[PDB]
Amino acid sequence: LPVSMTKTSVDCTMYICGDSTECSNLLLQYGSFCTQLKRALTGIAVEQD
Amino acid sequence: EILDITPCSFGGVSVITPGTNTSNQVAVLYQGVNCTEV
Ligand SMILES: *[C@@H]1O[C@H](CO)[C@@H](O)[C@H](O)[C@H]1NC(C)=O
Ligand SMILES: *[C@@H]1O[C@H](CO)[C@@H](O)[C@H](O)[C@H]1NC(C)=O
């Protein structure tokens, strides 16, 4: 029976932009889209432990 | 001559704080990097 998973953390600025500074100014125009993802990933990581 | 490239040093930065009510001392934690690199 599986009880745990892989604690995966996804960086939005490294996944979407990666190495572009011009696109980094456009991510702040959408609001807290990255905050919800980071909070969900942190919650999953805490739930696994 | 073939030169192998490697991405820059990056990772998650987490601040280990015991709460602002007790003390203001904090500790940084650089995830996924060695101590020889900043
Ligand atoms: C610390 O917690 C106590 C009890 O909850 C509270 O009375 C006090 O105001 C808090 N201190 C700060 C700086 O928030
Ligand atoms: C950091 O570098 C040292 C020296 O090469 C190595 O022994 C150690 O395993 C490295 N740390 C990690 C987490 O791999």
Side-chain angles (χ1 to χ4, degrees), chain A residues 12-13 15-42:
Chain A
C12 300
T13 60
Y15 175 81
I16 306 180
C17 300
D19 53 81
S20 180
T21 60
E22 296 79 8
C23 299
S24 299
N25 301 120
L26 299 180
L27 297 182
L28 302 179
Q29 208 76 7
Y30 286 171
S32 58
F33 276 84
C34 310
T35 303
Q36 303 177 7
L37 271 59
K38 294 191 300 296
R39 189 169 308 275
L41 294 177
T42 304

Side-chain angles (χ1 to χ4, degrees), chain A residues 9 11, chain B residues 10-11 31:
Chain A
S9 181
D11 189 9
Chain B
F10 69 99
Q31 301 176 175

Side-chain angles (χ1 to χ4, degrees), chain A residues 1-9 40-49:
Chain A
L1 299 174
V3 296
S4 59
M5 297 181 60
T6 60
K7 300 171 59 179
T8 301
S9 181
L41 294 177
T42 304
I44 295 180
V46 172
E47 178 182 330
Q48 298 300 330
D49 298 330

